[PDB]
């Protein structure tokens, strides 16, 4: 019955989300430098929202890897460790295939107010679920 609960200290979570959103956003900026001309402003905003929602829905799976590396430090972690790991995820996960699919299948989401609210959030405040 007992299973170790999943959670992370707020500072660590903030470091991870800031770096992950920054990396996904960098990848989207490059992708847009290639493909941006044909897209409307609201479609590009929708793609930024897609970055944040993407982090949200894959969060726990990423937490498996993050927890493995943290344990592999052999010591109590500090915020800098999560900053580095989050930047590694943001860099190493290439979202270009995903943008390509959304554009080529014309599935870029219609831009709605809740997407705008998520986009206006500080990356630190984007909610995530561990369990």
UniProtKB/Swiss-Prot annotation:
Function statement: Creates a 3 um hole in the egg vitelline layer through which the sperm passes. Does not have enzyme activity. Species-specific interaction between the sperm protein lysin and the egg protein VERL exposes a basic surface on lysin that may dissociate the egg vitelline layer via electrostatic repulsion. Plays a role in ensuring species-specific fertilization.
Keyword Hydrolase in annotation: no
Assembly notes: Monomer. Homodimer. Molecules associate into dimers and then rapidly dissociate again. Interacts (as a monomer) with the egg vitelline layer protein VERL (via VERL repeats); each VERL chain can bind multiple copies of lysin.
Protein keywords: Cytoplasmic vesicle, Fertilization, Signal
Primary localization: cytoplasm
Pfam families: Egg_lysin (PF01303)
Tissue: Sperm (at protein level).
GO CC annotations on file: acrosomal lumen
Species annotation: Haliotis rufescens
Subcellular location: Cytoplasmic vesicle, Secretory vesicle, Acrosome lumen
GO biological process: single fertilization
Name the record gives this protein: Egg-lysin
Chain segments annotated as coiled-coil in the UniProt record: none
Protein's UniProt keywords contain Signal: yes
Effect of residue 130 to N: Impairs VERL binding
């Amino acid at each position: 019955h007992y299973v170790e609960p999943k959670f992370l200290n707020k500072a660590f979570e903030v470091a991870l989300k800031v770096q992950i959103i920054a990396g996904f956003d960098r990848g989207l900026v490059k992708w847009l430098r290639v493909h941006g001309r044909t897209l409307s402003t609201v479609q590009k905003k929708a793609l930024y929202f897609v970055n944040r929602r993407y982090m949200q829905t894959h969060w726990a799976n990423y937490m498996l890897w993050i927890n493995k590396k943290i344990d592999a430090l052999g010591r109590t972690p500090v915020v800098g460790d999560y900053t580095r790991l989050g930047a590694e995820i943001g860099r190493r996960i290439d979202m270009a295939y995903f943008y390509d699919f959304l554009k080529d299948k014309n599935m870029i989401p219609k831009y709605l107010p809740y997407m705008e609210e998520i986009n206006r959030m500080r990356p630190a405040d984007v909610p995530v679920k561990y369990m």
